[PDB]
Amino acid sequence: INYYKDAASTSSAGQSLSMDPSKFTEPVKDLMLKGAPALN
Amino acid sequence: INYYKDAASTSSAGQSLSMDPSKFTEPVKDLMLKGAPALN
Amino acid sequence: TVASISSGPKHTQKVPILTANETGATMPVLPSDSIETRTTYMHFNGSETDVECFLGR
Amino acid sequence: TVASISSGPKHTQKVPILTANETGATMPVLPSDSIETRTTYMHFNGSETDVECFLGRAACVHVTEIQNKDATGIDNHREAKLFNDWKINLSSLVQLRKKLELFTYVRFDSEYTILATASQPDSANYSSNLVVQAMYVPPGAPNPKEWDDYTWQSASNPSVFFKVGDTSRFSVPYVGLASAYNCFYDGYSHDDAETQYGITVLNHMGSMAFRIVNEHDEHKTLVKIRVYHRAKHVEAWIPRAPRALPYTSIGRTNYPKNTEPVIKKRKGDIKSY
Amino acid sequence: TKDEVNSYLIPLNANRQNEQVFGTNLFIGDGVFKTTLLGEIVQYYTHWSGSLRFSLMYT
Amino acid sequence: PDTYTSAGFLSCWYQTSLILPPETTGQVYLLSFISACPDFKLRLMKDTQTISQTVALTE
Amino acid sequence: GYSDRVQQITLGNSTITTQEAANAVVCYAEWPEYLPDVDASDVNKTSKPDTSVCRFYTLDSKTWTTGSKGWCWKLPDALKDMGVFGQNMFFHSLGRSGYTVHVQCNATKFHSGCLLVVVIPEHQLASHEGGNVSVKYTFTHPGERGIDLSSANEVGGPVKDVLYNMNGTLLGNLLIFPHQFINLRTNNTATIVIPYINSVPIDSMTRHNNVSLMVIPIAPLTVPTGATPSLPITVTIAPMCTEFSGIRSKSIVPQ
Amino acid sequence: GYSDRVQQITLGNSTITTQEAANAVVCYAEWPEYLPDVDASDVNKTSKPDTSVCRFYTLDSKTWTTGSKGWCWKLPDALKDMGVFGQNMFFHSLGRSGYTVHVQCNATKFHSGCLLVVVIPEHQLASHEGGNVSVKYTFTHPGERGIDLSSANEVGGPVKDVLYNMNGTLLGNLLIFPHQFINLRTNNTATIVIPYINSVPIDSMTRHNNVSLMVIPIAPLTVPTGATPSLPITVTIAPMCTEFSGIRSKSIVPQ
Ligand SMILES: COc1ccc(N2CCN(c3cccc(C)c3)CC2)nn1
């Protein structure tokens, strides 16, 4: 129950439960498959 | 939920969301169309 | 809500920027009447300028 | 969810453990690519590492102090701590600062909590009960000058009145000019040859003004204000390397000269355990 | 040097060519703008965004 | 007024030049107005530097 | 017969071929794109010179020697004088751009050495003075010359200490930023595509640089016996999806 | 209430209003348009800066006095230094453009005078020396200053005799070219839209001017009694549908 009118006044947000490290761990242009050779 | 009986005791009103500047910006008797000459 | 529409070159007989202020009106001229604009949205309602808000603290 | 699958002997032409790090990727290698594993489940979600959780607890961001005393003959209230402002910022104290600067841009609502306690360091008959007023003087507003200016009427400026010993609490929406708060800024406010460099030229959210509403009693009373800040509704972009050297200034990245080696030297060889 | 009806009047000189009639920066919360209704309201708020309409009526 | 946040300048110049008819002389004036387009947004209310006081008024 | 190894990038009227690449990085897995209306604020139609600005400019070459500490360029600064890109830059009030960065360094199978090529969004430098000394404008706008981390401290300039990234963080952790290594034994180029990253939809190109490109020797250069002890490093960079807006008189900037 | 008389032209970030126009001429009844593929030869994609080059540049003003003979500007020369139009010009090998020309001259209902405003495609000037003396480059590239037909013969310059259009034809027949009069009693501006006219699809902007704009007093200026005896004439011109192609190093031209 929100007792207040504005959105800033609500409690903390709830877990992204998004999670996708590939923008950070695999930003390569041509896809790399694990197990296939790195450099062909 | 109002806890009180009288109307003065309720919280602030809620946004007019009315908004019509023409009583102030265009109080002319004969309508002016933008693009048409001001004085004919 | 659009804050500005897209508008391009103009070569008209219809000039929205020439007016006669002696009339007492403020003609509703916009950026797109005199330069070439691109679309943009308002993203805003004018909530905090409502008189209830202005006199309500 | 499985944390590890079962995997047995391998004799392949398909080697997942040989890679080329020059590419910039971190290939997702697992225990089961190089030893024989058994199934196990995660039993865990990673709840408490969510950025909302990481930045979402109150941190002390500022400690200031004001006193209640006879202002009679004081030529400069501000200077007597009759009242005190706080050119608002979060770079002041280092604990929360290192946490935020793990990100480049951050966006969130703030929920401030203000604790005020009183001290009476010299002989008093009693402890008086003072009411503090905290008024947010955004940029472009009259700035107090005396501890009871017309300013403090604060007819258009949000202000909270609470008692010393108590706490005041109120949150404010994300009041950044941009789409997010910059944690860093490699720019200037204009192409001037001598204008400052860095964030400072963006941090312009005004200052918080504190004062006691009470007139003076016979003794003097020191009131010390602690502001706590909790981020709610957090959004963070672009992770960066954590801060290694100590901080020297609000808003610049500068570290102190003749600082000490930050990497612990081995007591022994490279070969040592 | 003292407020006068005359500071509302921008003068124009006959026969000058190429020259400049007036100049101002656009700090709507200060300077010329500051006492106008626009200037006067803008001052009740911290941030502004939007287009301005500047018109000149010839007399 | 703030630098980072500054908005520009407005200037006005003779394009050709003012020309008065015969039997006429001196300066002519322009009146100038300012108003906001429907585009405009203002936010985060605060107190105006345009009004202050030193003692409460009375009747 | 496609290898990760050979590549061709054609952009405008200019083409680059590498026969010894190590894939390419696209920052944060996003490719440069123009500014959508939903994200727009300024009402001005923007100018998109296209092929006259989106081509490859090769900056002047550096020389890696055994004593090198590393070099740093800022964008869009490094290009402030390249062809029509630069003119547009000084002439509009606002502009926006992504880039393709191609760093080149070839040697032989007897050399060793490894460079880190990294892009840091919003790289705010530190003053070597400490305290709250600022870093003057000119110092953070070296132009095509870039900053040479093995040059001496100057007054009003930034600190040039490599183990600290010019900001109080350790060299070792720069790997959290989009980056690629050039290991003479593997690699001979590094290519990174940079999408436009800012907290505003479009900004000024002169008062704010939005990425520093940094090339840092990490495993020292080691040449074969009686080889000349140095290799040149060349940086070629191409603006991509550039847009300029708010045209006028032409900025005048310090120094 | 539309009159032939009032008009507004908005092009780029610039607008012109006239309250005393006399219609507008569109050369040969054709409006500027880009270069179609069917007509193309150079294989290069062209650059269309759009709003940054297609706006109105106002050249410096002239002064009509009772002794004036007339002035002449060449295009694209007159604009060789205006903003990004000019940069593009020196930086590409080829370019192409149409223009809107707006000539301004206001007076009062007591003045008299009438100017001819005409656009001449391929106006090859004559040497005042006769024979086969050429007209040097600099002389036919006056820039924004244009040529002042009442200035003196110079050496290597063109002839400036008005009854002969600077080429051996009579002033009276200039009316076969797109033109408009400014008759103080009627008119206060002249506007001509110029489509791109050439025998090749695109050309060099520096070695060849494709139109001369000419403003010539024909009925002498006559001011009311004890009026100052002169009026300024201003020329504002806007490139329209401009395209540049073959970008490179940046031409260096005489003088
Ligand atoms: C560097 O990042 C940040 C992040 C948040 C922040 N602000 C400071 C000002 N603050 C604020 C805003 C409104 C009212 C009051 C009392 C305080 C909000 C958070 N400042 N810098």
Which letter, b or e, does each residue of D188-210 get, where b requires 16 or more Cβ atoms within 10 Å of its Cβ? bbbbeeebbbbbbbbbbbbbbbb
Chain H: residue nearest G48 by CA?
H49
Centroid of ligand 1 to alpha carbon of D90 (angstroms): 7
User: What does each C-alpha distance from D259 to D262, G124, G165, G169, H194 come to in angstroms?
Assistant: 8, 20, 15, 13, 70
Q: Ligand 1, from D92, D103, D157, D181: best to mutate by most atoms within 8 Å of Cβ?
A: D181
Long-range CB pairs of D133-136 (<8 Å, 24+ gap) are: D133/D159, D133/D160, D133/D161, D133/D210, D133/D211, D133/D212, D133/D213, D134/D159, D134/D160, D134/D162, D134/D168, D134/D208, D134/D209, D134/D210, D134/D225, D135/D159, D135/D160, D135/D208, D135/D209, D135/D211, D136/D206, D136/D208, D136/D209
User: What does each C-alpha distance from D236 to D58, D103, D205 come to in angstroms?
Assistant: 18, 6, 20
Q: Which residues in chain B are closer than 8 Å to H6, comparing Cβ atoms?
A: 37
Phi-psi region of G33 (alpha: psi -120 to 50; beta: other; left: phi over 0): beta
Segment (H or E) for D181 = strand D181-182
Asked if C42 contacts C2 with a C-beta cutoff of 8 angstroms, the reply is: yes
Residues D249, G129: Cα–Cα separation, whole Å: 12
Kindly report the nearest CA distance between residue D86 and chain A, in angstroms. Answer: 23
Nearest-5° Cα angle at H40, H36 to H43: 125
G235 C-beta neighbours (distance < 10 Å), count: 24
Residues G134, G220: Cα–Cα separation, whole Å: 32
Asked if F49 contacts D140 with a C-beta cutoff of 8 angstroms, the reply is: yes
Centroid of ligand 1 to alpha carbon of D91 (angstroms): 10
Q: Which two tokens stand for residue B7?
A: 């109307």
Residues G120, G229: Cα–Cα separation, whole Å: 30
For an interface test with H, which of F13, F14, F15 has the most H Cβ atoms less than 10 Å from its Cβ? Answer: F15
Q: Which residues in chain A are closer than 8 Å to D18, comparing Cβ atoms?
A: 37-38
For an interface test with D, which of G169, G181, G188, G250 has the most D Cβ atoms less than 10 Å from its Cβ? Answer: G169
Asked if B8 contacts C46 with a C-beta cutoff of 8 angstroms, the reply is: no
Residue D199 and residue G124: Cβ atoms within 8 Å? Answer: yes
Q: Which two tokens stand for residue G214?
A: 């940094």
Give φ, ψ of G37 to 5 degrees: -65, -35
Q: How far apart are the first and last CA of chain C?
A: 29
**3 state SS of D53:** helix
G184 C-beta neighbours (distance < 10 Å), count: 22
Nearest-5° Cα angle at G120, D57 to G214: 145
A38 C-beta neighbours (distance < 10 Å), count: 20
Centroid of ligand 1 to alpha carbon of H181 (angstroms): 65
Task: Please give the tally of structural domains in chain H.
Answer: 1
Residue F52 and residue D150: Cβ atoms within 8 Å? Answer: yes
Residue numbers after which chain A breaks, C to N beyond 2.5 angstroms:
none
Atom 1 of ligand 1, nearest CA residue: D183
Q: Which residues in chain E are closer than 8 Å to F47, comparing Cβ atoms?
A: 44
Chain F: residue nearest C26 by CA?
F35
Kindly report the nearest CA distance between residue G181 and chain D, in angstroms. Answer: 4
User: What does each C-alpha distance from C45 to C4, E36, F42 come to in angstroms?
Assistant: 15, 24, 10
Count CB pairs under 8 A between chains C and D: 3
Structural domains for chain B: 1-40 (4.10.80.10)
Task: Point out which residues pair with C8 in neighbouring strands.
Answer: none
Closest to D29 measured CA to CA, from D41, D15, D43:
D15
Centroid of ligand 1 to alpha carbon of D181 (angstroms): 9
Instruction: Determine the structural domain holding residue D246 and report its residue range.
Output: 1-273
Asked if G18 contacts G187 with a C-beta cutoff of 8 angstroms, the reply is: no
User: To 10 degrees, the CA torsion angle through D92, D94, D96, D98?
Assistant: 120
Atom 8 of ligand 1, nearest CA residue: D89
Q: Which residues in chain B are closer than 8 Å to H1, comparing Cβ atoms?
A: 36-37, 40
Per-position DSSP letters for D116-136, written without gaps between them: EEEE--S--SS----EEEEEE
Closest to D135 measured CA to CA, from D77, D80, D206:
D206
Give the resolution value in Å: 2.9
- Is residue E17 within 8 angstroms of chain H, CB to CB? yes
The alpha-carbon radius of gyration of chain B (Å, integer) is 21
Q: What is the DSSP code (8-state) at residue H5?
A: S
In this complex, the chains that touch C, judged by 3 or more CB pairs closer than 8 A, are: B, D, E, F, G, H
Cβ of residue D134 lying under 6 Å from some atom of ligand 1 = no
Residue among B16, B26, B34 whose CB faces C16 most closely: B34
Residue among D23, D46, D239 whose CB faces A32 most closely: D23
Deposited experimental method: X-ray
Residue C22 and residue E57: Cβ atoms within 8 Å? Answer: yes
Cβ of residue D212 lying under 6 Å from some atom of ligand 1 = no
Cβ of residue D137 lying under 6 Å from some atom of ligand 1 = no
Residue D202 and residue F4: Cβ atoms within 8 Å? Answer: yes
G38 C-beta neighbours (distance < 10 Å), count: 9
Which ligand 1 atom sits closest to the C-alpha of D175? Answer: 12
Q: Which residues in chain E are closer than 8 Å to H233, comparing Cβ atoms?
A: none
Cβ of residue D183 lying under 6 Å from some atom of ligand 1 = yes
Q: Which two tokens stand for residue G236?
A: 């070629």
Residue C26 and residue E53: Cβ atoms within 8 Å? Answer: yes
Centroid of ligand 1 to alpha carbon of D139 (angstroms): 13
Segment (H or E) for A22 = helix A22-25
Residues G220, G175: Cα–Cα separation, whole Å: 18
Q: What is the DSSP code (8-state) at residue H61?
A: P
Residue among D21, D244, D256 whose CB faces G170 most closely: D244
User: What does each C-alpha distance from F32 to B22, E9, F14, F17, F40 come to in angstroms?
Assistant: 21, 8, 16, 19, 20
How many CA atoms lie less than 13 Å away from F41 in the CB half-sphere? 14
Kindly report the nearest CA distance between residue H109 and chain C, in angstroms. Answer: 22
Closest to D145 measured CA to CA, from H13, G212, E25, F52:
F52
Q: Which residues in chain C are closer than 8 Å to F42, comparing Cβ atoms?
A: 48-49
Q: Ligand 1, from D91, D103, D110, D233: best to mutate by most atoms within 8 Å of Cβ?
A: D110
CATH number, domain at G104? 2.60.120.20
**3 state SS of F14:** coil
Cβ of residue D88 lying under 6 Å from some atom of ligand 1 = yes
User: To 10 degrees, the CA torsion angle through D143, D145, D146, D152?
Assistant: -10
Residue H19 and residue C18: Cβ atoms within 8 Å? Answer: yes
Residues D63, H215: Cα–Cα separation, whole Å: 75
Q: Which residues in chain C are closer than 8 Å to B39, comparing Cβ atoms?
A: 20
Residues E26, E42: Cα–Cα separation, whole Å: 13
Beta strands in E1-59 (DSSP E): 9-12, 20-25, 45-49, 52-58
Cβ of residue D108 lying under 6 Å from some atom of ligand 1 = no
How many CA atoms lie less than 13 Å away from G250 in the CB half-sphere? 9
Count CB pairs under 8 A between chains E and H: 7
Cβ of residue D175 lying under 6 Å from some atom of ligand 1 = yes
Chain E: residue nearest F11 by CA?
E23
Cβ of residue D87 lying under 6 Å from some atom of ligand 1 = no
Instruction: Determine the structural domain holding residue G44 and report its residue range.
Output: 1-255
User: In the 3-class helix/strand/coil scheme, how is chain G assigned residue by residue?
Assistant: CCCCCCEEEEECCEEEEECCCCCCEEHHHCCCCCCCHHHCCCCECCECCHHHCCCCEECCCEEEECCCCCEEEEECHHHCCCHHHHHHHHHEEEEEEEEEEEEECCCCCCCEEEEEEEEEECCCCCECCCCCCCCCHHHHCCHHHCEECCCCCCCCCECCCHHHCCCCECHHHHHHCCEEEEECCCCCEEEEEECCCCCCCCECCCCECCEEEEEEEEEEEECCCCCCCEEEEEEEEEEEEEEEEEECCCCCCCC
Closest to G23 measured CA to CA, from D23, H7, H78, H152:
D23
Residues H50, H72: Cα–Cα separation, whole Å: 27
In this complex, the chains that touch E, judged by 3 or more CB pairs closer than 8 A, are: C, D, F, H
**Residue spans of alpha helices (H) in chain H:** 83-91
Cβ of residue D172 lying under 6 Å from some atom of ligand 1 = yes
CATH number, domain at D261? 2.60.120.20
Segment (H or E) for H117 = strand H112-121
For an interface test with G, which of A24, A25, A29, A31 has the most G Cβ atoms less than 10 Å from its Cβ? Answer: A29
